[PDB]
Amino acid sequence: TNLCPFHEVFNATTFASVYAWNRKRISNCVADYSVIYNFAPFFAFKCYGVSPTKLNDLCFTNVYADSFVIRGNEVSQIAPGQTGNIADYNYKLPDDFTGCVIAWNSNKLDSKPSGNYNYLYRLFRKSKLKPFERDISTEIYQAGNKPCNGVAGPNCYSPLQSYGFRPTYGVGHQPYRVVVLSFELLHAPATVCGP
Amino acid sequence: STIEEQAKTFLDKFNHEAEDLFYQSSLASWNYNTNITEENVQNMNNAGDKWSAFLKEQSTLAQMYPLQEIQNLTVKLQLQALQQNGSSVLSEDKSKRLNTILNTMSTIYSTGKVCNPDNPQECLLLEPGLNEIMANSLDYNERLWAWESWRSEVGKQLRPLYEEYVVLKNEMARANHYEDYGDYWRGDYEVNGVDGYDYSRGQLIEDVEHTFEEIKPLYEHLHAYVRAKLMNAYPSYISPIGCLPAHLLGDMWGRFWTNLYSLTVPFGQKPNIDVTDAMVDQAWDAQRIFKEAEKFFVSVGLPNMTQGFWENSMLTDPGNVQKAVCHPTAWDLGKGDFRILMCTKVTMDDFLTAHHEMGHIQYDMAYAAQPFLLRNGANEGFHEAVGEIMSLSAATPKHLKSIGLLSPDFQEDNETEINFLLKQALTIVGTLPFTYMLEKWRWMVFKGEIPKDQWMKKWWEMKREIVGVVEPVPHDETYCDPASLFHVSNDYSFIRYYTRTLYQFQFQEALCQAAKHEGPLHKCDISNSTEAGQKLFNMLRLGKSEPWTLALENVVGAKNMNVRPLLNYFEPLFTWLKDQNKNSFVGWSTDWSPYA
Amino acid sequence: DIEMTQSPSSLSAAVGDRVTITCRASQSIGSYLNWYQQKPGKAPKLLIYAASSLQSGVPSRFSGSGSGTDFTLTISSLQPEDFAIYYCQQSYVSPTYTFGPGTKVDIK
Amino acid sequence: VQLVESGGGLVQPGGSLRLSCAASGFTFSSYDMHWVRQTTGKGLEWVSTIGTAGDTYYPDSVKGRFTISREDAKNSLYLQMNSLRAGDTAVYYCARGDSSGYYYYFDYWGQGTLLTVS
Ligand SMILES: *[C@@H]1O[C@H](CO[C@@H]2O[C@@H](C)[C@@H](O)[C@@H](O)[C@@H]2O)[C@@H](O[C@@H]2O[C@H](CO)[C@@H](O)[C@H](O)[C@H]2NC(C)=O)[C@H](O)[C@H]1NC(C)=O
Ligand SMILES: *[C@@H]1O[C@H](CO)[C@@H](O[C@@H]2O[C@H](CO)[C@@H](O)[C@H](O)[C@H]2NC(C)=O)[C@H](O)[C@H]1NC(C)=O
Ligand SMILES: *[C@@H]1O[C@H](CO)[C@@H](O)[C@H](O)[C@H]1NC(C)=O
Ligand SMILES: *[C@@H]1O[C@H](CO)[C@@H](O)[C@H](O)[C@H]1NC(C)=O
Ligand SMILES: *[C@@H]1O[C@H](CO)[C@@H](O)[C@H](O)[C@H]1NC(C)=O
Ligand SMILES: *[C@@H]1O[C@H](CO)[C@@H](O)[C@H](O)[C@H]1NC(C)=O
Ligand SMILES: *[C@@H]1O[C@H](CO)[C@@H](O)[C@H](O)[C@H]1NC(C)=O
Ligand SMILES: [Zn+2]
């Protein structure tokens, strides 16, 4: 085994925003999901298509790990066939998903008494999101029939809004770090898997 | 695009920029109520200023979306909340004058001083002092002196600046396309659009005057009993034929009749239920009280309270190191933050207060998922009702015997249980005519059908035909008797109390009927009844998203407000009163006047 | 959770007839659904996995057909040794697998 | 292959039991075990899951209340129940899980045991 990074995605000092979310293409070693079951209690462990118990023995061509921070009540939105603010505008999951979703609370690390406004998410967009494709933009979203020429104001809003996490928030409004694992196969010979 | 979707994109941005600016202000207010310092005041003021500026900007911006072109009955309510101009249509030179008048009223009421017509080194203010002398005193002349003195100095210097207040607020009401300023206040009892559930503003002017007709017998018999039992306390001061003096009701204005209990006890041989000694014997503390109340709430079906509640909420007075305002308050800071501020002492009164306050936190928790503008009670009389019900069930002897506060025999004799219904009738029944009187007078003084010169000719005329109270000494026109009250001096709608008393007992009867309770209604403990909790939760979750008619129907099954549950709850008391009023006189004449 | 519903509530047939029971899901589940038999007085037994595959041991008279959301289980010939309750359960969402309310097959 | 349950009885509310399931005829070190309960009307319901390498899974209902553990010394699976409520009255079965690839199922259930509260 070469220990291709799983202790880096979960132990990163700084995560990404909802509309950014870092995508890591991990297929380089023998998978060691034993550490996944450890590292604090999990608010959710909802592997789809594959039983969580019988991981650690299955040959996967390419693993995709996506990480971002959201609030608690939106954690249930990271699932196939779900409609919501995060699903329709920030992060979309296909209906034929084969992977896992792991969420854990991060009030101690990702919250400040004054407020953490470094985390952003999109709220308004002309059209919805196709599965697994990003959109980073700052153009003013036209809400009427008068072009604003890139100037905020009436019927012309900025698409990104900040969270503002504070330690005294409730469970549903607390920061939650989410790692989603996506699996797929290709015609290339399988080499990235255990003995 | 369409105007239908140009309002959703505005409220979606509003609901995210409002929560953050409301939480900051709420946290600042909590910090100021924990420490009373100088930095805390500045932080609170800054947060409040930012919140007010944001609300004003959004109210000015939101006017571009006409009401007639929008139809969902959910966005429309939020637009109604946001599009209210308020005190902004008036000229800039009039809003400042109105605010100055309001601040002058607040300062005049707060800084009260009678000083007694004697050595001016002995000055007694209202709280404490005047409230104490009206609560635990038996003298006639002293009570009359205090009653006249409070409304002499304060009342004279409060009426001349009340007329301009009325004129300016009526002008603002006309500017907001309303009829009067009273019609403005009867606006939270208005619903349009949903067929079969409409309730016009004027229809309230019927219901309050339709449900009050059949409360007249019970209150008349209670009034007769109180007068008979006060005959001996003040022998040559009250006549059996009619009304009673307003300075002998144990309260400064006669809002509550609780303090007369010690003078009107049914049977003084045996005491009332008081678990105060048991708290000391079993070493009770604040945390135990709150855990017991939480267990009571869980036994019905409602959930626990969050871990943040037990750690971020102060439950005992810190002491001399800090300065805290000891006043039981339930705080819904938003974003999952619920707290309770109360200086707890071992007493049954605090035991029940832990229950009214925990009710508001549960009712606040119920509608936490609704939009920001709809996160409130369906009307103004639903939050203090889903809170006074729990207290009733907690006070029940069965609940106290099921947790270990009384010796487990405690024969529930009818000799004693009638001592508990009368005490609650001295606070719940004795306030409804007062509220109806005050609200009616305020409504028809805003209406314009009571001239300026007849402001105080009609105030004491209503209190003779609706309530049984009469002035001790003549009051000329220059006085202002209502202005002495906290609510008249400031700006607070006062009819919410009536509409509450009449909702809490409806909800209690519905819950007890759902709990398969057999027997009298006052012996009803809704504990260990999941169906009652579910029935209550179906209403607590709605909030303002749906008309209060449907919310009331979800639990009661009646379209509108009713008083029959209230009369059923007091049926044994009413029967006893009938039994013991056979030799007395029931009813009051117009007046003989304490002055002659 | 993904609810599962079954139709019909009850079914009556004689020996040799063909009986079909349909199972409906709330969300798309692909081919992740399995079939169980609950002969009274005993424990449930696996009949068909992968919504089409025939488990080793069960008679071939049982057939599972479906793809997507709505699935069907059909017994071509009914026999007296079939009075039981049949359940459809999901495998797409783990480990919170949820069962259906079962079906009544009264032999008469 | 056989699975035998034990631990049935009556308990007052707030009590605790330690139910056991003994499996024979195969290798316990490979397959994974599940506890599934059945009530009249509500139907079968998954209660607990244990796998090969020290992982435990519970529903939202029975969370922080069940402590499933296994010992491979004598091929026995244990389940400890505390703070039992009135809704835990059911018949409990211990089942074995297996997959022919991506598709997972329960192979064998056994006999079961009864639990009731008063
Ligand atoms: C509310 O119920 C609890 C629990 O009682 C159980 O549930 C009931 C629905 C019923 O089925 C009872 O038979 C059950 O035992 C009561 O708590 C118990 O009260 C009894 C009083 O005889 C006491 O002996 C037990 O120790 C209590 N158990 C505890 C505290 O865990 C409670 O008294 C009921 N509340 C009432 C009656 O107001
Ligand atoms: C709130 O006040 C604004 C003005 O400050 C009102 O807007 C005007 O409404 C009148 C009514 O017909 C129009 O003629 C004007 O064109 C509007 N704009 C201005 C700048 O005057 C608004 O109608 C008021 N809202 C309510 C509910 O009364
Ligand atoms: C994560 O990083 C911290 C800090 O170095 C370390 O103490 C901890 O052991 C790491 N976690 C894991 C699972 O390695
Ligand atoms: C509130 O009072 C406590 C009492 O010691 C003090 O420690 C704390 O700093 C005060 N809070 C603020 C914001 O000053
Ligand atoms: C009203 O708005 C809500 C909020 O999204 C929406 O769900 C509902 O469908 C709307 N009403 C109608 C009739 O479309
Ligand atoms: C509520 O809290 C008590 C004690 O903390 C606990 O026993 C009970 O299970 C809790 N209720 C729920 C529904 O979790
Ligand atoms: C209470 O019950 C007794 C028992 O018969 C009865 O005599 C009495 O009239 C009842 N009422 C009062 C007020 O004592
Ligand atoms: Zn209150």
Author numbering:
A (entry chain B): 333 to 527
B (entry chain A): 19 to 614
C (entry chain L): 1 to 108
D (entry chain H): 2 to 119
Copy text verbatim from the article accompanying this structure deposition:
Receptor binding and immune escape have been recognized as two major drivers for the evolution of receptor-binding domain (RBD) of the viral spike (S) protein, which is responsible for receptor recognition. Receptor binding is a key step for SARS-CoV-2 infection. In this study, we evaluated the binding properties of BF.7, BQ.1, BQ.1.1, XBB and XBB.1.5 RBDs to human ACE2 (hACE2) and determined the cryo-EM structures of hACE2 in complex with BF.7, BQ.1, BQ.1.1, XBB and XBB.1.5 RBDs, respectively. As previously reported, the binding interface of SARS-CoV-2 RBD in complex with ACE2 was divided into two patches.
Since November 2022, XBB and XBB.1.5 have emerged, and XBB.1.5 subsequently became the predominant pandemic strain worldwide. XBB is a recombinant between BM.1.1.1 and BJ.1 sub-variants, and XBB.1.5 is a descendant of XBB, which has more substitutions, including G252V and S486P in S. Notably, compared to the XBB S (KD = 123.7 ± 6.18 nM), the XBB.1.5 S (KD = 25.97 ± 0.94 nM) has an increased receptor binding affinity to hACE2. Compared with XBB RBD, XBB.1.5 RBD only possesses an S486P substitution, but the binding affinity of XBB.1.5 RBD to hACE2 is ~2.7 folds higher than that of XBB RBD. The sequence alignment indicated that the RBD residue 486 is a hotspot mutation. The side chain of F486, V486 and P486 point to the α1 and α2 helixes of hACE2. P486 interacts with M82 through VDW. In addition, RBD N487 also forms an H-bond with hACE2 Y83 in the BQ.1.1 RBD/hACE2, XBB RBD/hACE2 and XBB.1.5 RBD/hACE2 complex structures. In the BQ.1.1 RBD/hACE2, XBB RBD/hACE2 and XBB.1.5 RBD/hACE2 complexes, RBD N477 contacts to hACE2 S19 with an H-bond. In the XBB RBD/hACE2 and XBB.1.5 RBD/hACE2 complex structures, hACE2 H34 forms an additional H-bond with RBD S494.
